[PDB]
Amino acid sequence: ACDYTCGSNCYSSSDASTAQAAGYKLHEDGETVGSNSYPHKYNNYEGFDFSVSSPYYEWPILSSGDVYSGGSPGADRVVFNENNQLAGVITHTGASGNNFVECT
Numbered sequence: 001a002c003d004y005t006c007g008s009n010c011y012s013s014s015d016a017s018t019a020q021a022a023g024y025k026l027h028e029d030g031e032t033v034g035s036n037s038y039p040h041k042y043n044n045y046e047g048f049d050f051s052v053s054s055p056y057y058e059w060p061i062l063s064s065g066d067v068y069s070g071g072s073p074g075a076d077r078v079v080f081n082e083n084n085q086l087a088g089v090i091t092h093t094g095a096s097g098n099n100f101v102e103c104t
């Protein structure tokens with residue numbers, strides 16, 4: 001079973017932790033990758049009720065299992081905070097425009 005289901009993409013807790021670890025390191029080093037400059041601040045326009053405090057940052061999580069290193073980000077993202085705590089896994093899949101919905 002999936003710990004996080006983003007549209008049709010299936011992720012385990014280990015997949016999320018791995019992506020988060022990569023995103024947080026770039027965050028700490030002040031580096032970004034990709035045309036959308038990931039990781040970057042997640043403003044939470046959606047108003048999701050995360051259990052951890054902000055600021056929030058988003059980083060792509062890939063269905064391929066690989067760690068994001070540039071190129072197409074896909075529709076899924078892991079959201080983490082300044083304390084390197086996982087806030088949630090969200091996706092553009094099933095959401096209108098550039099909005100996000102949480103992965104179930």
Ligand SMILES: Nc1nc2c(ncn2[C@@H]2O[C@H](CO)[C@@H](O)[C@H]2OP(=O)(O)O)c(=O)[nH]1
Pocket residue numbers: 036041042043044045046058098099100
């Ligand atoms: N939907 C959404 N987009 C956000 C949020 N925070 C930042 N963004 C960014 O704001 C713009 C919305 O059009 C995009 O550049 C989007 O980046 P991503 O596409 O990389 O997520 C957020 O909380 N919700």
Ligand SMILES: [Ca+2]
Pocket residue numbers: 010011012015065
């Ligand atoms: Ca996996």
